[PDB]
Amino acid sequence: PERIDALIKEDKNTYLKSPAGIFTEATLPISDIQNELTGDTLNAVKLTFTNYN
Amino acid sequence: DATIRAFELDTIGYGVNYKFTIDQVSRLIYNVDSLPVNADTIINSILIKTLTTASGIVTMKDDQDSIVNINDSIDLTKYVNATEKNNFLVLKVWAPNMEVQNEYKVNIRMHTMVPDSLSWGKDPIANNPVRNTAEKQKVVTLGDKILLFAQNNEIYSTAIPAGSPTDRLNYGQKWDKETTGKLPDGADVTSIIRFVDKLYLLTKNKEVYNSNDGLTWTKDEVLNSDGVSVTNLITSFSDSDGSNHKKINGIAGIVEINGEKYFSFAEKDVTWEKDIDKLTVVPAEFPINNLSADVYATESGTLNAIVVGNTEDGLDNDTATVVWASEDGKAWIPMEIPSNNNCPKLVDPSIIHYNDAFYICGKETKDDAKGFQKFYTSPTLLVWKGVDRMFMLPGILPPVKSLHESSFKGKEVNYTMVVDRNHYIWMVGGQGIDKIWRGRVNKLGFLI
Amino acid sequence: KYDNWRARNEAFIDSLANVYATASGRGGLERIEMLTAPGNYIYYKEMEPMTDHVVKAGNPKYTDYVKVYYKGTNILGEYFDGNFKGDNPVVDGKDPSEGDSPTTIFQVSGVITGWGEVLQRMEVGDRWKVYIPWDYAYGSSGTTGILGYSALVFDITLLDFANTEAELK
């Protein structure tokens, strides 16, 4: 538990430790899309997560 | 008009093919993995294949330039180990327009000694220096010296060269008396134990003694607590033994709290744990006398320790030499085996972890094959086999056309052993052998 | 766009070939003789050497394995394949839109003749940009993604080379 709680507090990166460990949470900019692209047809919205070795 | 290459050779052993590197800049060919010692009878008439190039016309110097018999067999025994007394198979390859000209030189690399074989030599390398060879023996290594202790306050020593186990070292032929002598009163020499840079020892009266160099010994102020009493020191865990991710440092032993025996662990520079609510009790099957131990790193990066020894004088349904393991110092756990794959009962057994396997040696008491008869080995610590071939006991010679007089095989004597940091096995015999034996499997000295 | 592809690609190679022969400082170019056709040359450009070499002196052989960061592009600079897509390989990369590059294993005898010639003369940790003719690339019809008769330009970083994959991977 202490190691998991310590790794949750790192701020340069996020982890994905699977067996009931760590998830990562993302905040989408829905309000900005709703303001800037009103009247458009959305053809694609792409989100990418990428990792270290 | 190229000289592309795929040079290959057929099965030497059944289904065994050897790979050749092709250095086109330096124009030479060789096999990285050397052929076995057996092969000099096989490559006496052998077949080359897959010698594909842009135009197959190729010749070897003979005075004449005769064409290669690519579809026919050849004697290669003249071309082995061509780097000195240099005698390469040198051959010439033509371009399809016959304008561009090249030669390549081929070297068939072959072993001079069998890789996976324990080499003891023809003779024991030294005599046992102890006076009155009946006396109990013990051997241990410290720094760059190997120490041999005898019960009558008597010490002998020999020193090790600078380093690099793969280098052409020779040592052990000379032993010296450590003239200051005088290991402490009432000591029990078979209890001597190593730590990171110090030696520890136990007395009959259950004092603990220690030393920095083995020359002189003193009591210590941290393990000799009142209320407790020590009865055995088993092994020590340290960063020097392996790669422990668990971060364990200390000495493991047995303490008799209020008249009952418990496992306990003395962490670095602090006293034994004596809290009776959170120690653990020693089982009745656990070894009592002449303990041997080893510590090694699991493939997971965690240290582990294993021990064997003599049990109490008599106990029910006991017929085998079970080995006890421990992931730390708090509690030891037996590797009991339900099936027939369990090794026999042995007297004064010793255990080592060596060349990615486990080995045990000892003397048997079945009255039809008494004495040291063979080593016993395990790949995974839970199944044990007798080695009927290479890796024999010392003094077991191959046919030069035999048993050496000072061999262990069939003897029933006192002894001791250790493995040093060049992976030499050291075996020391008491009354009835009177000699020092030294050996290592050849595969550990190779540069490969 | 892709008109008269062969002639212009060959003209690019000829431009490099005569620049090495007439320009000051060789125009930055250097060259190696090709063992599958003596008298022909492959042209390359030296670049920033690495700082984490696995201290493996010597050069790779023809029938042994190689670990690299690499990127392949055509004459117009467009992407073909590789481990990385920017102007440098990515390790501990600060930009969260690009991941750290993987390393790939190749056999020197299992690649195009340009690679098979240039890889036998690098030392671990060299970075070279190499310019190979269509005679020694895939050539003729070309593979998927190649318009045929194409001169590829590769950016190579040699990390490691060994006799087997198991001691390298």
Question: Within an 8 Å CB–CB cutoff, is residue A43 touching chain C?
Answer: no
Residues 98-157 of C with CB under 8 A from B: 109, 120-121
**Which tokens in the block code for residue B229?**
């009493």
What angle is formed at CA B225 by the lines to CA B222 and CA B229, rounded to 5 degrees? 125
Closest CA to B3 of B74, B92, B85, B69: B92
CA-CA-CA-CA torsion sign (C128, C133, C135, C138): positive
The nearest CA of chain B is from the CA of C36 a distance in Å of 4
> Which residues partner with B106 through β-bridges?
B29, B89
CB contact under 8 A, C100 and A48: no
* Shortest distance, CA B3 to any CA of chain C (angstroms): 6
Q: What are phi and psi of B77, to 5 degrees?
A: -65, -15
Is B123 within 8 Å of B172 (Cβ atoms)? no
C109 contact residues in B (CB cutoff 8 A): 6, 22
- Which amino acid is located at B349 in the chain? P
DSSP for residue B89: E
> CA separation (Å) from A29 to A35, A39, A45?
10, 17, 12
Distance CA C147, CA C137 (A): 12
Give chain A positions within 8 Å (CB) of C100: 51-53
Residues of C in contact with A53 (CB under 8 A): 100, 102
Q: Which residues of C touch A52 (CB under 8 A)?
A: 92, 99-100
What's the sign of the alpha-carbon dihedral A27, A30, A35, A41? positive
The 8 Å CB, 24+ separation contacts for A36-45 are none
Chains B and A touch (3+ CB pairs under 8 A): no
Among C37, C109, C120, beta carbon nearest to B1: C37
List Cα–Cα distances, A17 to A6, A8, B349, in angstroms: 13, 10, 45
User: Are the CB atoms for B217 and B209 separated by under 8 Å?
Assistant: yes
Backbone angles phi, psi at A2, to 5 degrees: -65, -40
From the list C158, C159, C160, C140, the residue with the least C-alpha distance to C150 is C140
Q: Are the beta carbons of B25 and C121 separated by less than 8 Å?
A: yes
Task: Residue C96: list chain A partners with CB under 8 A.
Answer: 50
Q: Which of B2, B21, B32 shows the shortest C-beta gap to C37?
A: B2
Query: Whole-angstrom Cα distance, residue B233 to residue B3?
Result: 69
Find, among B182, B307, B186, B330, the residue nearest to B252 by Cα.
B330
Interchain proximity C63–B19, CB inside 8 Å: yes
Q: Report the C-alpha gap between B78 and B44 in whole angstroms.
A: 9
Resolution value in angstroms: 3.5
Contact of B127 with B143, CB cutoff 8 Å? no
Contact partners for chain C, using 3 or more CB pairs closer than 8 A, are A, B
CA–CA distance, B139 with B429 (Å, rounded to integer):
11
A24 reaches C (C-beta below 8 A): no
CB contact under 8 Å between A51 and C97, yes or no, is no
Please state, as a whole number, how many other Cβ atoms lie within 10 Å of the Cβ of residue C104. 13
Cβ contact B198:B156 at 8 Å: no
Would you tell me how many other CB atoms lie within 10 Å of the CB of residue B40? 15
Residue B131 CA to residue B129 CA, distance in Å, equals: 7
Any idea which residue has 């009103």 for tokens?
A38
Please answer yes or no on whether A50 and C92 come within 8 Å at the CB atom. Answer: no
Contact of chains B and C by CB distance (3 or more pairs under 8 angstroms)? yes
